[PDB]
From Swiss-Prot, chain A:
Present with 4340 molecules/cell in log phase SD medium. Cold-sensitive mutant KRR1-21 is a deletion of amino acids 234-239. Component of the ribosomal small subunit (SSU) processome composed of at least 40 protein subunits and snoRNA U3. Interacts with snoRNA U3. Interacts with MPP10, KRI1 and with ribosomal proteins RPS1A, RPS4A, RPS4B, RPS8A, RPS8B, RPS11A, RPS11B, RPS13, RPS24, RPS25, RPL4A, RPL7B, RPL8, RPL23, RPL25 and RPL28. This is KRR1 small subunit processome component. Residues 87-157 form the KH domain. It comes from Saccharomyces cerevisiae (strain ATCC 204508 / S288c). The keyword ATP-binding does not apply. The keyword Glycoprotein does not apply. GO terms for molecular function: RNA binding. Its main location: nucleus.
Swiss-Prot record, chain B:
The chain holds residues 150 to 297 of 346 of the full protein. Interacts with KRR1. This is Protein FAF1. The gene is FAF1. It is found in: Nucleus, Nucleolus. Required for pre-rRNA processing and 40S ribosomal subunit assembly. Seems to act in the processing of 35S rRNA at the A(0), A(1), and A(2) cleavage sites. Signal peptide: none annotated. It comes from the Eukaryota.
UniProtKB/Swiss-Prot annotation, chain D:
Transmembrane segments: none annotated. It comes from Saccharomyces cerevisiae (strain ATCC 204508 / S288c). Component of a heterotrimeric complex containing IMP3, IMP4 and MPP10. Interacts with MPP10. Component of the ribosomal small subunit (SSU) processome composed of at least 40 protein subunits and snoRNA U3. Required for the early cleavages at sites A0, A1 and A2 during 18S ribosomal pre-RNA processing. This is U3 small nucleolar ribonucleoprotein protein IMP3. It comes from the Eukaryota. Belongs to the universal ribosomal protein uS4 family. It is found in: Nucleus, Nucleolus.
UniProtKB/Swiss-Prot annotation, chain E:
The keyword Ion transport does not apply. Belongs to the universal ribosomal protein uS15 family. GO terms for molecular function: small ribosomal subunit rRNA binding; structural constituent of ribosome. Component of the small ribosomal subunit (SSU). Mature yeast ribosomes consist of a small (40S) and a large (60S) subunit. The 40S small subunit contains 1 molecule of ribosomal RNA (18S rRNA) and 33 different proteins (encoded by 57 genes). The large 60S subunit contains 3 rRNA molecules (25S, 5.8S and 5S rRNA) and 46 different proteins (encoded by 81 genes). Its main location: cytoplasm. This is Small ribosomal subunit protein uS15. PANTHER family: RIBOSOMAL PROTEIN S15P/S13E, SMALL RIBOSOMAL SUBUNIT PROTEIN US15. GO terms for biological process: cytoplasmic translation; maturation of SSU-rRNA from tricistronic rRNA transcript (SSU-rRNA, 5.8S rRNA, LSU-rRNA). It comes from Saccharomyces cerevisiae (strain ATCC 204508 / S288c). One of its GO terms (cellular component) is 90S preribosome. It is found in: Cytoplasm. InterPro entries: Ribosomal_uS15, Ribosomal_uS15_arc_euk, Ribosomal_uS15_N, uS15_NS1_RNA-bd_sf.
Length: 210, 124, 119, 61, 141
RNA sequence: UUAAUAGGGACGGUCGGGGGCAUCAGUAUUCAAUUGUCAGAGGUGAAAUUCUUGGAUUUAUUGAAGACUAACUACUGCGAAAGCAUUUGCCAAGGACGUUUUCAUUAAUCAAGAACGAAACUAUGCCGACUAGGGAUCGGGUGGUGUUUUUUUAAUGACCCACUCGGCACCUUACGAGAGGAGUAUGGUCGCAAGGCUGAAACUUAAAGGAA
């Protein structure tokens, strides 16, 4: 029985917070008989199976946990990844647009004023969403992750997320009505040739006198 | 932009999360989230016509307490912003004078005491 | 100990449990969540994946294989790189059925540079 | 008050409390629910003690 | 301070305060003049002559050592250019870009840079025409 | 006559995801050829539509086509802006730095003119001719120092510290004449509008509906 291991590097600024919580991380992983190591010299965190490990798939969740911790997700939130329902998704957004200003403004649109748009999406989708640089890292149930991807990608294609927030609220009330389960919900939802050589310059008045 | 329910939910999302499907409907919402939500709504309507001094009044606190409360809250904001800055996290924009509204703002009801900003510095 | 290769393809809408020989050219047993459930909504469920793995595991024991290397993957490409719920449940079911799990690897198709238009 | 405004349980119980307090004499009026907070005071209860009622009935100076 | 650019650099040479020859310099002034004439005969420009003398012959400045500039020394000996050295290099650079634009007609950047170079030629040519160093009829290309 | 901490040109080692033309690679997608197996596969909140025992989806090997250049990717670099991210070669061009090289006022701002050139949807910053700074970072240069490095094959860097010039930003500071909103009411004007079961009126009139 060979040992399956995963290792993830983390930034140096994130070292201080990992040192404090590593006892909690060790305790959480010990419940599944998964051993972990925190190397501050190399700046890496490793998770490895043991001979007492019984769940074959837990190492994959343990790998996701250390990845989340490296990306500045707080441990009380990240430790939920060990649960079967929860999953982690990373959405690229750097490739949708080519104008820097248009990229920045649309990304802010995802956050919204005071973070209101982002918080509303998290509440409706039950997902933890964190917008970083050219990517959006979202964690939560698989149904929520699927919804978050649509909103994030649509935002970068000029669809205001406020439409998606409204759509999710309407879909939720419809999900609680049994009569309209079969019927389509769309009606309720809101709707000369180039010359290489320059032309000559107009001479200055002094040039004319010369 | 003119949907009252949708706009209300977006503005009130921070209070509802702090004091918790999410119960955002008025009939469903109970507890502190109800009391804070009603007050938040009533202040918004009163801002248009009510005089600035009269509508909002910071609760009376001694100086050595309030100055201490402001200092600790500002330190939390700086830590929050530095941690986001050193990471890649994108944060909502805040005007220069105003304090950023971190999660601790909503839970601790800090604004009723310290206020949105230091008025003395804003006036000058 | 005769070794196979269990190729699990866990999409958000379905889960394939496919066991083959080490080369991969010879299919031994392919079972899907859709064949083990009656409704289209539950194909992606962990339960449907669990039934699929048990059917595959029994067939693998018939032919002679007793251990398998796991190669799980997601839809990949321009879409999600995260395996769905079924893949994780399918992996557990193979172990409980008794087949030895040799090695687990994620082989999701990751494009260097997607076919997505910047414009 | 923290129960939702249209709750039948909320409306029933607030009325029962207003009924009982008015009957005791602690509350002068039954119209407003805010009286349970603003107008419920020790002075209101002391104002129903036997000496005070004798005074208001002019049985004593 | 750059014209046709946003750079504000100040890199330059700092001529020493004293205007007399260095004490350690112990070569005849006439010998320096002959060296200048020889290099000009070989085809070196006045700017390049000063570099060689300064680098290898200890001539800190031709004016300080000999009392006359390199340009005046050469002209006294019959050596003088067709056109001022700075104008000579501007024209050569314009020619090279025009040659490149001939082979590469899609290089819009080179087209932009050529406008800047020809503009520099016109401003520089106009100055020399005013001072009469350049004949009044002279026109670029 | 100086040789402006004005301007130009020259030379030296450099710097760059600046431009043009070729060239190289990468996994992904689509298609195709074989290839093992067999009943579903994609998609949705459900479906519908689409493919499928002529083998779909999935598996292995291989080929072709178009696009793109992930992670590294930064409040970093280059470009006048729009913009620019694989390798190598060529073609010119450019910035800063270094210079005891050269011209000698050749300059600054500029209406006209010339070159290049679905989208928005919560934002915001007193301004200037203007003082002294701090941390970090990019490029160049000088000096110190001792670790990586290494030796008469040629090349010959990385890190630490101080100083300095020029950039992208951040955080602070001294100085300055820099010369309508929210509502209410309506004996006016213009529109929109009430009612009585339908059939059914010149007809107290059928069948069938409506209400009950
Ligand atoms: Mg220059
Ligand atoms: Mg000078
Ligand atoms: Mg040069
Ligand atoms: Mg180059
Ligand atoms: Mg190139
Ligand atoms: Mg390219
Ligand atoms: Mg770079
Ligand atoms: Mg720039
Ligand atoms: Mg690359
Ligand atoms: Mg500097």
């Amino acid at each position: 029985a060979e040992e399956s291991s995963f290792m993830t590097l983390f930034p140096k600024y994130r070292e201080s917070y990992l040192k404090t919580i590593w006892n909690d991380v060790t305790r959480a992983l010990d419940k599944h008989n998964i051993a972990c190591v925190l190397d501050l010299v190399e700046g890496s965190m490793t998770v490895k199976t043991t001979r007492k490990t019984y769940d074959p798939a837990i190492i994959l969740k343990a790998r996701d946990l250390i990845k989340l911790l490296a990306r500045s997700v707080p441990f009380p939130q990240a430790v939920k990844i060990l649960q079967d329902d929860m999953a982690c998704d990373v959405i690229k957004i750097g490739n949708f647009v080519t104008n820097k200003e248009r990229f920045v403004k649309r990304r802010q649109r995802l956050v919204g004023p005071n973070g209101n748009t982002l918080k509303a999406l998290e509440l409706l989708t039950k997902c933890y969403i964190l917008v970083q640089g050219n990517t959006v890292s979202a964690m939560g149930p698989f149904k929520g992750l699927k919804e978050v991807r649509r909103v994030v990608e649509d935002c970068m294609k000029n669809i205001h997320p406020i439409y998606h927030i409204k759509e999710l609220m309407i879909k939720r009330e419809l999900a609680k009505r049994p009569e309209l389960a079969n019927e389509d919900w769309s009606r309720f939802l809101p709707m000369k040739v180039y010359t290489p050589f320059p032309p000559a310059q107009l001479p200055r008045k002094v040039d004319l006198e010369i | 932009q003119n949907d009252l329910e949708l706009q209300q939910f977006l503005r009130e999302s921070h209070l509802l999360s702090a004091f918790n499907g999410i119960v955002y409907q008025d009939d469903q919402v109970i507890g502190k989230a109800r009391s804070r939500t009603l007050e938040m709504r009533l202040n918004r309507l009163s801002r248009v016509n009510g005089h600035q001094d009269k509508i909002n009044k910071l609760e009376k606190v001694p100086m050595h307490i309030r100055r201490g409360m402001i200092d600790k809250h500002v330190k939390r904001i700086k830590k929050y912003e530095q941690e986001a800055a050193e990471g890649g996290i994108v944060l909502s924009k805040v005007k220069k004078g105003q304090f950023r509204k971190i999660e601790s703002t909503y839970k601790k009801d800090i604004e009723r005491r310290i206020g949105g900003s230091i008025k003395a510095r804003d006036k000058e | 100990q005769v070794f196979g290769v269990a190729r699990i393809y866990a999409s958000f809408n379905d889960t394939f449990v496919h066991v083959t020989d080490l080369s991969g050219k010879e299919t031994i047993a392919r079972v899907t969540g859709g064949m083990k459930v009656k409704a289209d909504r539950d194909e992606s469920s962990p339960y449907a994946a669990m039934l699929a793995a048990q059917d595959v595991a029994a067939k693998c024991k018939e032919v002679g294989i007793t251990a398998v290397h796991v190669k799980i993957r997601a839809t990949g490409g321009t879409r999600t790189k995260t395996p769905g719920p079924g893949g994780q449940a399918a992996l557990r079911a193979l172990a409980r059925s008794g087949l030895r799990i040799g090695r687990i690897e994620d082989v999701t198709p990751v494009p260097s540079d997607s076919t997505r238009k910047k414009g | 008050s923290l129960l939702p405004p249209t709750d039948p349980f909320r409306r029933k119980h607030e009325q029962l409390l207003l009924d009982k307090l008015y009957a005791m004499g602690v509350l002068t009026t039954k119209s407003k629910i805010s009286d349970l907070e603003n107008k419920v005071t020790v002075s209101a209860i002391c104002r129903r003690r036997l000496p005070v009622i004798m005074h208001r009935l002019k049985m004593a100076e | 301070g750059r014209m046709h650019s946003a750079g504000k650099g100040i890199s330059s040479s700092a001529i020493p305060y004293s205007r007399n020859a260095p004490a350690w310099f112990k070569l005849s002034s006439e010998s320096v003049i002959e060296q200048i004439v020889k290099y000009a005969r070989k085809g070196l420009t006045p700017s390049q002559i000063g570099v060689l003398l300064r680098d290898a012959h200890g001539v800190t400045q031709a004016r300080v050592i000999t009392g006359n500039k390199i340009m005046r020394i050469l002209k006294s000996n019959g050596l003088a250019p067709e056109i001022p050295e700075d104008l000579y290099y501007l024209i050569k650079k314009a020619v090279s870009v025009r040659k490149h634009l001939e082979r590469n007609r899609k290089d819009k950047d080179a087209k932009f840079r050529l406008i800047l170079i020809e503009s520099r030629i016109h401003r520089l040519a106009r100055y020399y025409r005013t001072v009469a160093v350049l004949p009044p009829n002279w026109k670029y290309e």
